[PDB]
Prior knowledge:
- ATP binds at residues 19-25, 136, 166, 171, 175.
- Its EC number is 2.7.4.2.
- Catalyzes the reversible ATP-dependent phosphorylation of mevalonate 5-phosphate to produce mevalonate diphosphate and ADP, a key step in the mevalonic acid mediated biosynthesis of isopentenyl diphosphate and other polyisoprenoid metabolites.
- Pathway: Isoprenoid biosynthesis; isopentenyl diphosphate biosynthesis via mevalonate pathway; isopentenyl diphosphate from (R)-mevalonate: step 2/3.
- By secondary structure, the protein is α/β, with parallel strands linked by helices.
- The protein has one domain (1-188): P-loop containing nucleotide triphosphate hydrolases (Rossmann fold, 3-Layer(aba) Sandwich), CATH 3.40.50.300.
- 41% of the residues lie in helices and 15% in strands.
- The chain is built from eight helices and five strands.
- It has helices at 24-35, 46-55, 67-81, 87-90, 107-116, 130-135, 148-151, 169-184, and strands spanning 12-18, 40-43, 98-101, 121-128, 161-165.
- The chain has a five-stranded parallel beta sheet, with helices on both faces.
- Helix 1 (24-35) crosses helix 8.
- The longest helix is centred in the C-terminal third of the chain and has 16 residues, at 169-184.
- 29% of the residues are buried.
Amino acid sequence: GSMAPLGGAPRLVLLFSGKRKSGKDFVTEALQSRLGADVCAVLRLSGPLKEQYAQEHGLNFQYKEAFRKDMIRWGEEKRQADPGFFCRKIVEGISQPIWLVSDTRRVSDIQWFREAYGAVTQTVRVVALEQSRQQRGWVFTPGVDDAESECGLDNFGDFDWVIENHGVEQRLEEQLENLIEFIRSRLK
Length: 188
């Protein structure tokens, strides 16, 4: 109904996604660095996932990683009945004009943001050449690389922008500079 009661009203919301070891964090941190924390905020859906999970289980706050799977299964159950369950929590009290959601992973995350903020939402997919992922130590891992957390957007192609990481620092910098100038056009 009222989709995000605690959310501000950004001039631009960038929805990032990308498989592990592809350079997504490199991209999002570079953008926030160039823009400044007061201009750009980085929001992580994993934040409320951890906070709410632990909470509804006898908590406090924000072998030891099979628990990660527990949280994922728990989060999926919440998300299936309430797509915006975690989205509503990351946008609360964010006063910066630019929002960078660094970890959308499912189509529902994109659909929720496009419906709630429509006019100012832009989706950006980070993809890396396979050898670049290999250099990072990536090896196909059953239970991870074939799980929804990593493949939820594999059949989605309606991204606004796609950053292909070629494993070359200069090439990625150029892409970052292009994106930064796009973001800046929204702060005028």
